[PDB]
């Protein structure tokens, strides 16, 4: 009866604990949010490094 019921409860929790999750592993402030904003460095809209070397096409276009 009750003596069997509590034993069944303990055993039932036993298998539940045995087949637990797959080894669960142990796991920001607004003051540092502005630091991330200030650390952002965007890129130029257009790259001008190779403009000079490739500019002969415009100079050779007939008008």
Interface contacts to another protein, rule CB under 8 A:
3, 6-7, 10-11, 14, 17-18, 20-26
SS3 22: coil
User: In angstroms, what is the minimal distance from the CB of 60 to another protein?
Assistant: 60
CA-angle at 22, arms to 20 and 23, nearest 5°: 90
CA distance 13 to 27: 26
DSSP, collapsed to helix, strand or coil, labels residue 13 as helix
Residue among 7 and 33 whose Cβ is closer to another protein:
7
The nearest distance, CB 19 to another protein, in angstroms, is 9
Closer residue to another protein, CB minimum distance, 28 or 63: 28
């Amino acid at each position: 009866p009750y003596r069997t019921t509590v034993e069944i409860g303990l055993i039932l929790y036993g298998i539940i604990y045995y087949l637990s999750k797959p080894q669960q592993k142990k796991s920001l402030s607004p003051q540092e949010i502005d630091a991330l904003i200030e650390d952002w460095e965007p890129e130029p809209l257009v790259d001008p490094s190779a403009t000079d070397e490739q500019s002969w096409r415009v100079a050779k276009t007939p008008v």
